[PDB]
């Protein structure tokens, strides 16, 4: 059965004011706003969490019901629209245990897991994932390319008790593999005398907080349609219902906005000369 | 009263003139003859490569000459030769080529500075420490084997900052690392010294891990300049017989009295003993023998003079309170001499904990660890507090005694002729010493500040005059003549 560990679409318009706790670790943190963006497919189903200040560190997080994935599949999902097409900025999520005092968190706070696209500089455009393990923060070996444009896109992560994972983008698989084969948790086998397997790689003791702490140069991007659950099929159907319904409407509407821009620009060029 | 009370103005003037002539000679001797205090040669360490034969067998690597080591110019050349850490040794030969070190260079300082190169993937960790496996040896002739002198771990903390933005556009630029102190030896007694620095690395122990990328090790050797020591000894061999003559004259003039000496005369004689302790050129034995403790002994010998002179001023001011005390016993001066005695002992304990410990480990330095740093700073702070407290006591005493002098001076005509001479002579005798001491102290501080800001040389006409050496010789002459005049002018009639 699908356990809804966390879920949000801001359908109430104001539930953010109660569910999220901003950090007061530093006084100059950027402040989020809730908006549907310059172009959207739905007026309310796309009104997500938006960055608004340029060249700022951001720190926002929301708590959820405690749970442990020991002996259970783990799923995380969210959607992002890059309204400003950042040249540098974070677009990822962090999950924390209940020990995190959300009033004081920052980029150096200890998370259980990290997931999301990371776009700073045109030289690196790869999705960023980091799993904590026995005091180590470990990052992936293989690479996954992130999406480019301002359009609203969906991201999803999945982890299984068989020490395997898979990555879902726009309700489509992009990567899959095994944890100890793709992360440097354990020393290499070659028989090396120090080697011994550990099945507990995929699991953590507890989780109780979902966090969005990051740096951006260009503000404007919006985050929406989050979900944390155990069921892969529940996440797939939620992603369909939350992103496929808007994909076509937003496509058409930003296409018509681009066409309006092209008319205005060409008629301005005609009038100016 | 004292002889100064009897001296006519003419004879006092001629004494002052002779003293000033000797003063100017003592300034010139350091000014023109002496070669300046200290040399500072800078060696680039030569990155020798271990031949892998030395698992346990010990051999020394030489940068140049015969049997020079397998040598690497740029440390990157290690990579395609597949050379690794624990094999690169930063060998240094102390006297630069075709030179020697001679016992007249009364000490050696060595301080390190590191050419750490910034690289995005190998930044210095926030609390990184270097763990050198230093070893040093000496030799006495260009063909004998090296024989070991020391072999010690030398951990140090990296105080390094990066001024350029931490951008891959600026990789390879060096950090601005501070000069970490390395070693001190109280006497050179052998002609050549060879020094090997190694940086063994171990990931699990984290020894020398994350200190950045080191391109080169620069080592600066400081020593007292060879001619300055000979000038210094030529001065001390002149001052010693003079002070012995003055001491024996003063002792005879003190003993040959009906009354026993007063406390002022005893402390004057004690100041004389303290200074004739400094004049005796026992350093001239250090050019023959291998005595490492010379620096500590010199420091204690100088401190005994400072802690004697600072007490002399207070005893002098106390012994001129005109009324209601007239007591001579030393025990009455606890409140004033206690601060300077405590400060002196505390600063002596600090100087012990550094310089005397260095006798067993030439690479030791108390500033390495936080416990030692805090303890040494506590000792220095207590010394400073004691000094400031003493100075407040001295200013209060000077104010009070001028109060007494003014009060008594408002009544001089009233009493008998001989007592009037006694008290007026006391006033003059006190004012003379305070004016002379203010002049000497102000002139010493002025020439000390000048030696701090000056380049070390001054071009006059066709010649160069040393400023730093003239300062040392001139101040030493100043205070020696001060003690001479003090002894002569304040002896009994």
């Amino acid at each position: 059965e699908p356990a809804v560990y966390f879920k949000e679409q801001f359908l109430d318009g104001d539930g953010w004011t109660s569910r999220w706790i901003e950090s007061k670790h530093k006084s100059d943190f950027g402040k989020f706003v809730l908006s549907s963006g310059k172009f959207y497919g739905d007026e309310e189903k796309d009104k997500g969490l938006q960055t608004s200040q340029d060249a700022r560190f951001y720190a926002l997080s929301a708590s959820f019901e405690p749970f442990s994935n020991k002996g259970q599949t783990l799923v995380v999902q969210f959607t992002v629209k890059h309204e400003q097409n950042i040249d540098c900025g974070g677009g990822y999520v962090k999950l924390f245990p209940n020990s995190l005092d959300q009033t004081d968190m920052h980029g150096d706070s200890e998370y259980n897991i990290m997931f999301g696209p990371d776009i700073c500089g045109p030289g690196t455009k790869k999705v960023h994932v980091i799993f904590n393990y026995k005091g180590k923060n470990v990052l992936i070996n293989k690479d996954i390319r992130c999406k480019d444009d301002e359009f609203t896109h969906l991201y999803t992560l999945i982890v299984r008790p068989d020490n395997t994972y898979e990555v879902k983008i726009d309700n489509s698989q992009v990567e899959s593999g095994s944890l100890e084969d793709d992360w440097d948790f354990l020393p290499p086998k070659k028989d090396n005398p120090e080697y011994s397997p550990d099945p507990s790689i995929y699991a953590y003791d507890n989780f109780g907080v979902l966090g969005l702490d990051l740096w951006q140069v260009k503000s404007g991007t919006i985050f929406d349609n989050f979900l944390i659950t155990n069921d892969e099929a529940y996440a797939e159907e939620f992603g369909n219902e939350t992103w496929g319904v808007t994909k076509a409407a937003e496509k058409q509407m930003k296409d018509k906005q681009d066409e309006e821009q092209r008319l205005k620009e060409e008629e301005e060029d005609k009038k100016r000369k | 009263g004292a002889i100064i009370e009897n001296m006519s103005t003419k004879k006092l003037c001629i004494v002052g003139g002779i003293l000033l002539v000797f003063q100017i000679i003592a300034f010139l001797v350091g000014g023109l003859i002496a070669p300046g205090p200290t040399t500072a040669v800078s060696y680039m360490s030569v990155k020798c490569v271990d031949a892998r034969k030395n698992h346990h067998k010990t051999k020394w690597f030489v940068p140049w000459g015969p049997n020079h080591c397998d040598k690497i110019r740029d440390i990157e050349e290690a990579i395609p030769r597949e050379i690794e850490a624990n094999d690169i040794v930063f060998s240094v030969h102390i006297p630069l080529p075709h030179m020697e070190m001679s016992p007249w260079f009364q000490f050696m300082l060595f301080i390190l500075q590191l050419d750490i190169a910034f690289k995005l993937n190998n930044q210095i960790r926030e609390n990184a420490e270097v763990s050198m496996d230093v070893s040093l040896a000496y030799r006495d002739d260009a063909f004998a084997e090296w024989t070991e002198m020391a072999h010690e771990r030398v951990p140090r903390k990296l105080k390094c900052t990066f001024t350029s933005p931490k951008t891959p556009e600026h990789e390879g630029r060096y950090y601005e690392c501070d000069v970490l102190p390395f070693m001190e030896i109280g006497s050179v007694a052998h002609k050549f010294y060879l020094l090997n620095i190694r940086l063994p690395v171990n990931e699990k122990k984290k020894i020398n891990v994350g200190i950045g990328e080191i391109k080169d090790i620069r080592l600066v050797g400081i020593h007292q300049n060879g001619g300055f020591t000979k000038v210094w000894f030529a001065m001390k061999t002149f001052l010693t017989p003079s002070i012995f003559i003055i001491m024996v004259w003063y002792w005879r003039r003190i003993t040959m009295m009906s009354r026993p000496p007063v406390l002022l005369e005893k402390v004057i004689f004690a100041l004389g003993i303290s200074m004739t302790f400094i004049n005796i050129p026992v350093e001239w034995f250090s050019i023959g023998f291998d005595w490492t403790w010379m620096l500590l002994f010199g420091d204690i010998r100088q401190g005994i003079f400072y802690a004697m002179l600072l007490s002399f001023w207070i005893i002098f001011c106390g012994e001129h309170m005109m009324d209601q005390h007239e007591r001579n016993h030393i025990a009455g001066y606890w409140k004033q001499v206690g601060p300077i005695a405590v400060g002196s002992f505390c600063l002596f304990i600090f100087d012990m904990c550094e310089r005397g410990v260095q006798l067993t480990n030439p690479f030791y330095s108390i500033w390495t660890t936080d416990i030692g740093t805090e303890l040494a700073m506590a000792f220095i702070i207590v010394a400073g507090i004691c000094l400031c407290l003493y100075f407040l006591f001295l200013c209060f005493m000077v104010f009070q005694v001028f109060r007494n002098i003014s009060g008594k001076q408002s009544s001089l005509p009233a009493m008998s002729k001989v007592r009037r001479l006694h008290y007026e002579g006391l006033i003059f005798r006190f004012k003379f010493l305070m004016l002379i001491t203010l002049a000497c102290a102000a002139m010493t501080v002025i020439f000390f500040i000048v030696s701090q800001v000056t380049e070390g040389h001054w071009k006059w006409g066709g010649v160069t005059v040393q400023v730093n050496s003239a300062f040392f010789t001139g101040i030493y002459g100043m205070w020696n003549l001060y003690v001479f005049a003090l002894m002569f002018l304040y002896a009994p009639s």
């Binding site: 045109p122 070996n141 690479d143 | 070669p35 300046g36 205090p37 040399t39 500072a40 040669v41 800078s42 060696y43 680039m44 360490s45 030569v46 940068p63 110019r73 440390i75 290690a78 990579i79 050379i83 690794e84 850490a85 690169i88 030969h93 630069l96 080529p97 020697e100 300082l109 301080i111 500075q113 050419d115 190998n122 600026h170 390879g172 060096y174 000069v179 001190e184 940086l199 690395v201 020398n208 891990v209 994350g210 950045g212 080191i214 600066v220 400081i222 020593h223 060879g226 001619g227 420091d299 100088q302 401190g303 600063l347 002596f348 100087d351 310089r355 000390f448 030696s451 701090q452 040392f472």
Partner: protein
């Protein structure tokens, strides 16, 4: 081998080579380090100190012109010679330089009496006696060469930080010792790059004290000001670097690459001199996830990563 294989030396340089034979490898090292810095500082600016194996002119005709590029090359070469000779004296491989007197009985300003102070002058001395020797003929080219060479040497002379250590009574600073510390040669590279961006153009003049002609350069003092022995000078306009042209000695950017994505370090649309700004993507193989000692040969594992090749026409 000494003073035989090297073809380009002028008689003063042959005499210097014959006398100070041990120094010459250090001078070669200085030339090499200077050229490495001039390659690094211009690795994007349409001209990147490209070397050619002809061995008669290792950069080709382009640096024979009195242009800012030749200005920078001469300045950085002089700074490199000075730096490398000073370093080699510091390593102790060179027995020639500085004070080299063994014993002095009477006051004689030697090692055992006065110490050594003349060592720090040696780098400037050798650099000026070597590099300026070939620039004696009183042409405008040679005057510019001398001024730029002195600018390069003064760049090293300016950036030497003074550091001090003190000892005395109980470790207090009554006896203070100070010495000059060499600057990192990358810093000199950036400083000369800054001077190159601010180099002053200035025009030639001709007159002689006797019946004949001698040349000198006159500043363009209408707006700018040139400080002697500090700023690089030139008098020939730099040629266009887009097309290959061996006559001027310029090689085209047909093979060069740049930060094509959305920008260009000096303009990708410009330095590419055409259109078509991407050529390949390559699966580069490299060591990765390494333990990273402080020195060398980490002997770590390796992996392959995809990089885009923005080589442009």
């Amino acid at each position: 081998i000494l003073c035989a294989s090297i073809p380009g030396l002028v008689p003063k340089q042959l005499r210097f080579c014959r006398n100070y034979v041990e120094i010459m490898p250090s001078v070669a090292e200085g030339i090499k380090i200077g050229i490495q810095e001039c390659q690094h500082q211009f690795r994007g600016r349409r001209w990147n100190c490209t070397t050619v194996h002809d061995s008669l002119a290792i950069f080709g005709p382009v640096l024979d012109k009195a242009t800012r590029e030749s200005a920078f090359v001469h300045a950085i070469a002089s700074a490199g010679v000075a730096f490398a000779v000073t370093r080699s004296c510091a390593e102790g491989t060179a027995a020639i330089c500085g004070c080299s007197s063994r014993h002095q009985g009477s006051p004689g300003k030697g090692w055992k009496w006065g110490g050594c102070s003349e060592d720090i002058e040696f780098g400037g001395m050798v650099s000026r006696e070597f590099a300026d020797a070939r620039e004696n003929r009183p042409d405008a080219r040679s005057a510019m060469n001398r001024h730029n060479n002195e600018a390069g040497r003064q760049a090293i002379a300016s950036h030497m930080h003074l550091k001090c250590k003190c000892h005395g009574l109980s470790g207090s600073c009554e006896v203070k010792t100070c010495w000059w510390s060499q600057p990192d040669f990358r810093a000199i590279g950036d400083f000369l790059k800054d001077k190159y961006d601010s180099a002053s153009e200035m025009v030639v003049e001709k007159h002689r004290e006797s019946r004949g002609w001698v040349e000198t350069l006159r500043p363009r003092y209408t707006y700018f000001k040139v400080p002697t022995e500090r700023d690089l000078v030139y008098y020939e306009a730099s040629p266009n670097f887009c097309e290959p042209n061996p006559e001027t000695g310029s090689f085209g950017t047909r093979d060069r690459t740049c930060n094509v994505s959305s920008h260009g370090i000096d303009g990708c649309d410009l330095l590419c001199c055409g259109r078509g700004h991407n050529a390949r993507a390559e699966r580069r193989r490299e060591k990765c996830r390494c333990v990273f000692h402080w020195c060398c040969y980490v002997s770590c594992q390796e992996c392959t990563r995809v990089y885009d090749v923005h080589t442009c026409k």
